[PDB]
Symmetry: D2
Subunit: 115 residues, 4 copies
């Protein structure tokens, strides 16, 4: 899998489980075309989003539905979602790991790009 997403919960110190994640690919007319989606597992990870054949160079948006996650845990959140926007580049390593660390009023994201 060339594209993995991993989400952690900074309040509970745990993987963020059952978080919905939507990936889009920027179309020629600048609209965001649905590309892949899933929900994080019990390890807070989401594998199998796409394949090497399908994951061509281009601009992608990974949308993490953090609002719904916090709501289901009874906690009031600030953001509608977390958004990660990046260009996939064949010149760089082959596997992209998009990691996100969630708090109610803050989040951080990190790209781990490896061979």
């Amino acid at each position: 899998c060339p594209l993995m997403v991993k989400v952690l919960d900074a309040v509970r110190g745990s993987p963020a489980i059952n978080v919905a994640v939507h990936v889009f690919r920027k179309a020629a007319d600048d609209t965001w075309e649905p590309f892949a989606s899933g929900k994080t597992s019990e390890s807070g990870e989401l594998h199998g989003l796409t394949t090497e054949e399908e994951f061509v160079e281009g601009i992608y948006k990974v949308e993490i539905d953090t609002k719904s996650y916090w709501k289901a845990l009874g906690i009031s959140p600030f953001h509608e979602h977390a958004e990660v926007v990046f260009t996939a580049n064949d010149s760089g390593p082959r596997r992209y790991t998009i990691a996100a660390l969630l708090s109610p009023y803050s989040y951080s994201t990190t790209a781990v790009v490896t061979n």
Copy 2:
């Protein structure tokens, strides 16, 4: 000032200066309408984006053009930009500070929301 943005550079340990910021608001028809824009100062702060009157209830997106910033410094970063999407003024007028901390392959964003 009901909406402020502060940006830091985690590589240099300094304010991130001349960072372009674009703010949008979700319209009735569900598209992102331009709302306000500006660039961070030598302190890494962006003030005067909008006014109390104009900053009504809505869903706002604050786009911080981190790629433009890093490339202007001769560096090739991972992200196109940092996007911060939030409902604002849903319980009456608040003051929002959107803070961001920038590294070439990583960023974090925080919101400080106060009631004047």
Copy 3:
């Protein structure tokens, strides 16, 4: 003010108020000597820890008592405290801001270093 500390609360999206902070400096004999201490204000900032004259070259440790803060709020966090260890004034006097962002199981710290 050559050494400032700013602390935010990532759960509430607010300044972290009344956070105890203890600063130490590594002594000739390699032990941590007490240097300065204080508590963050309603803005989450701690000013006036030390003076230009007293803040000499050295290795400093800024201990932010995050456990005391969370427990005072009726919350059981993971860390005892957040420790920030750095050489200071090695190239002459600088101004340091140590920023921290607090969650119950996580924190981040940033240094902004300026030359007056």
Copy 4:
């Protein structure tokens, strides 16, 4: 392993490899007693630090030699090291993952405590 450490590099978007990590346990007289140590692998992870038998309740310090890491990559760092200080508690889940994300002038750490 009840105690794992994982380190990432926010500048290169990669695991932080060959980072020295020292763990200490607080002794009765308040001194820090060496407990375990190692160097992160090519995945930026360090396994096998200790065992369930050895990892008793108490206060621990995980020291991550970030200064040396940045130096070896030709980059000027701010911190002497990153320090993570915490109480190990038998009332909580069994596996502690101490994660750290490194920049020259900033770092974040997160505890992932699971079953």
